Design an enzyme around this catalytic site. Structure first.
Site, PDB file in Angstrom:
ATOM      1  CB  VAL A 160      -7.466  -0.793  -4.533  1.00 27.52           C
ATOM      2  CG1 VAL A 160      -8.340  -2.273  -4.621  1.00 27.52           C
ATOM      3  CG2 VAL A 160      -8.591   0.383  -4.061  1.00 27.52           C
ATOM      4  CD  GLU A 161      -4.736   3.515   0.717  1.00 27.31           C
ATOM      5  OE1 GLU A 161      -3.803   3.435   1.419  1.00 27.31           O
ATOM      6  OE2 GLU A 161      -5.933   4.086   1.159  1.00 27.31           O
ATOM      7  CG  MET A 162      -2.183  -1.152  -5.735  1.00 30.15           C
ATOM      8  SD  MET A 162      -2.203  -2.056  -7.257  1.00 30.15           S
ATOM      9  CE  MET A 162      -3.333  -3.575  -6.910  1.00 30.15           C
ATOM     10  CG  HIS A 196      -1.807  -1.328   1.352  1.00 31.01           C
ATOM     11  ND1 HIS A 196      -2.632  -1.570   0.215  1.00 31.01           N
ATOM     12  CD2 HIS A 196      -1.936  -2.168   2.235  1.00 31.01           C
ATOM     13  CE1 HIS A 196      -3.461  -2.711   0.395  1.00 31.01           C
ATOM     14  NE2 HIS A 196      -2.914  -3.115   1.781  1.00 31.01           N
TER      15      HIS A 196
END
Ligand code: HEC
Ligand code: HEC
Length: 312
Positions: free
Chosen positions: A113-115, A71
């Site tokens: 879904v923070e990548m 993340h």
């Protein structure tokens, strides 16, 4: 009877279907694509890491060792929360400044879904494989350029929503099966509600809905839960559902013993003081929160091609 009535006014059982998050209606095609992605290691720059790496759906949906990556994290190591039932938490795992919540915090499903990898590399990777293009087309009918970072995120979020664990003994009890819990576990339930644990751990996941300036500190045992200096740092009150499967515990993952985890949360300041017998009773109760882990067919991913970025 009345205990059951009390429990029902404080908690809720896991429903058959998950709540729709941000209008993301679940479909077979979206969920299937999201599953492929959840297990896809090529989204990481090294090609060695996937969501399952840190949220193992066969082992509690979390990680056994604290980590400093994932993340786009840029600080010290922290424990990983479970993806199981995360969709029901309004607050997300938090291990930082209360002041940063306003702009940086979001729902669990979305935080998921923070990548670390850039959107460009991710999209290029997915577009390099025909099969992924077809899956995106199946999942997003009507879109001419379906493979986008936003759509990838939507598909993963759809899969995340399906990771719920219904039918725990406690849920059966809530629903009316008075025999779902034995006397020992019922005493634990009564104590959980009578010692004030519900001030912070309640609702569908027995926690996960608010942040508090109280966190684990390495001072029963060599640990304790204390208020942070000037309430500068806050933590999400942990959702206790499936706690049996989610060791190690707390933001740091320093505690492996469920009994110890329960003990350090019993304090005069919090008005949750407990004696040793009560700690054991609550432990018994918490073990009844383990639900049915969803069945997962391991996805068969498509082979890399000449255009697939190489492992870095
Ligand atoms: C280890 C290197 C990880 C990888 C790969 C992924 N996640 Fe993760 N996740 C990790 C930690 C240490 C944390 C908390 C730290 C923070 O950055 O949030 C999380 C958190 C989540 C959550 C939040 C759960 C909640 O608040 O209840 C979810 C839903 C989640 N992670 C999902 C997720 C998905 C879908 C991933 C693949 C795209 C993924 N994570 C990768 C560590 C790691
Ligand atoms: C709000 C002021 C709380 C009260 C009252 C209780 N708990 Fe709690 N708990 C709270 C937070 C903010 C956290 C996370 C702290 C961190 O350092 O990460 C927790 C955590 C737990 C855990 C660990 C769960 C996990 O990691 O899965 C357990 C087992 C737990 N809490 C139990 C518990 C019990 C039994 C309580 C009544 C005696 C209780 N908590 C009260 C916040 C608050």
């Amino acid at each position: 009877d009345n205990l059951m009535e009390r429990a029902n006014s404080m908690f809720e059982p896991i429903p058959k279907y998950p709540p729709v998050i941000d209008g993301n209606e679940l479909t077979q095609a979206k969920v299937e694509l999201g599953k492929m992605e959840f297990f896809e290691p090529r989204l990481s720059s090294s090609h060695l890491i996937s969501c399952n790496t840190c949220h193992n759906v066969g082992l509690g949906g979390d990680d056994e060792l604290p980590t400093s990556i994932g993340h786009g994290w840029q600080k010290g190591p922290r424990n990983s929360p479970t993806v199981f039932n995360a969709v029901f938490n309004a607050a997300q795992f938090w291990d930082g400044r209360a002041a940063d919540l306003a702009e940086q915090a979001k729902g669990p499903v979305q935080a998921g879904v923070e990548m670390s990898s850039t959107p460009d590399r991710v999209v290029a990777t997915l577009k390099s494989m025909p099969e992924y293009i077809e899956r995106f087309e199946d999942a997003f009918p009507g879109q001419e350029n379906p493979v986008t970072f936003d759509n990838m995120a939507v598909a993963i979020e759809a899969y995340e929503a399906t990771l719920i664990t219904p039918e725990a003994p406690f849920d059966k009890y809530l629903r009316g099966d008075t025999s779902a819990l034995n006397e020992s576990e019922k005493e634990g339930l009564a104590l959980f509600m009578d010692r004030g644990c519900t001030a912070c751990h309640s609702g569908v996941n027995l926690g996960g809905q608010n942040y508090y300036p109280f966190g684990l500190v390495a001072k029963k045992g060599r640990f304790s839960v204390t208020e942070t200096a000037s309430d500068e740092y806050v933590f999400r009150a942990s959702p206790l559902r499936n706690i049996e499967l989610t060791a190690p515990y707390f933001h740091s993952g320093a505690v492996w013993s469920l009994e110890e985890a329960v003990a350090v949360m019993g304090t005069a300041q919090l008005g949750t003081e407990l004696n040793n017998d009560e700690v054991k009773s609550i432990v018994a109760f918490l073990k009844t929160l383990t639900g049915n882990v969803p069945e997962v067919t391991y996805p068969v991913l498509p082979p890399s091609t000449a255009n697939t970025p190489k492992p870095v």
